[PDB]
Symmetry: C2
Subunit: 184 residues, 2 copies
């Protein structure tokens, strides 16, 4: 589900004109480094890491500083800036450190006008995590690039069967996605 | 007890000709940073962090990379190199990253000939953590700079009373320390 997060983030950036690759390991100057999303547009290339939480806690200074060190180790591969996405908030210390070293930050509601809540809600997007589906079904959908309820609908029950859903489960998931989309 | 660790490490370095200060917060280029020990000798100045564990687990790459970022943020204050002490071992990834960015590492048994086990055992030192004492008694002793059993003995029951021990507890702790030292 860092797998889901990276795919959701790549998709949101693709909607804003970025070319993306997910879950990339590169050989750093020193050691191998995982990059959750590599995003490029108009000659800028970002090293993106997702740090999401399932409880209401901050992404803090230690995470920011780790991330900066990661960026330094991969920078020779042609990265403009590191960028952290979180689904909660950054601490004030993390915000300060980031502004001062040059880490872009996107939280649920940060920066003003550009948080994940805006990226999703401005397009009317609903992550498939809202659906009554298990981690297996979930992962199958994501691997097919299905990250939003709309993707389930436009994939179609035929395609959901290929990726591993029973006919019955495919019908149920499509109906659930339609209900979310029509129930706002 | 990061309080104890920093004091134990400073004392071991003082035995090897370093001038030390413990638990120092400095204003970094970006934000405040905690340094567990600042150690200097012959014009070299180290930023030391202790990462100890009470279970047999490695100090790993994330900790090393955090520490390197910390070093970069305080480096303008005149630090030669960062240095991590751990009471277990560093992972192979941490060792590799450290060698490649320039972080000194000292583990229980690393580097060869220079691990904490050697620093203690070569001088016949016994940390006071071996004694039947609580966190309060422990902290009192450490604040007085009492980190080894020998320090309890040379402090004397009179001094242990000043720092807060009852007469009875002072006698018991001295007897326990004598028993450790004579029981090797
Ligand atoms: Cl949707
Ligand atoms: Cl001793």
């Amino acid at each position: 589900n860092l797998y889901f997060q990276g795919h959701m983030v790549a998709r949101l950036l693709e909607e804003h004109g970025f070319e993306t690759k997910t879950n990339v390991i590169v050989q750093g100057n020193c050691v191998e480094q995982e990059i959750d999303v590599v995003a490029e547009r108009d000659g800028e290339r970002y090293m993106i890491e997702c740090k999401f939480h399932n409880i209401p806690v901050y992404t803090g200074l230690k995470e920011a500083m780790y991330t900066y060190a990661r960026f330094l180790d991969v920078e020779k591969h042609g990265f403009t800036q590191p960028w952290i996405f979180t689904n909660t908030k950054f601490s004030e210390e993390a915000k300060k450190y980031a502004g001062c070293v040059g880490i872009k930050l996107t939280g649920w509601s940060y920066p003003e006008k550009e948080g994940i809540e805006v990226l999703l809600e401005s397009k009317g997007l609903y992550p498939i995590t809202i659906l009554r589906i298990d981690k297996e079904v979930l992962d199958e959908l994501v691997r097919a690039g299905l990250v939003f309820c709309r993707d389930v609908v436009s994939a179609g029950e035929e395609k959901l069967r290929e990726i591993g859903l029973s006919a019955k489960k495919a019908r149920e998931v499509i109906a659930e996605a339609k209900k979310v989309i029509g129930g706002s």
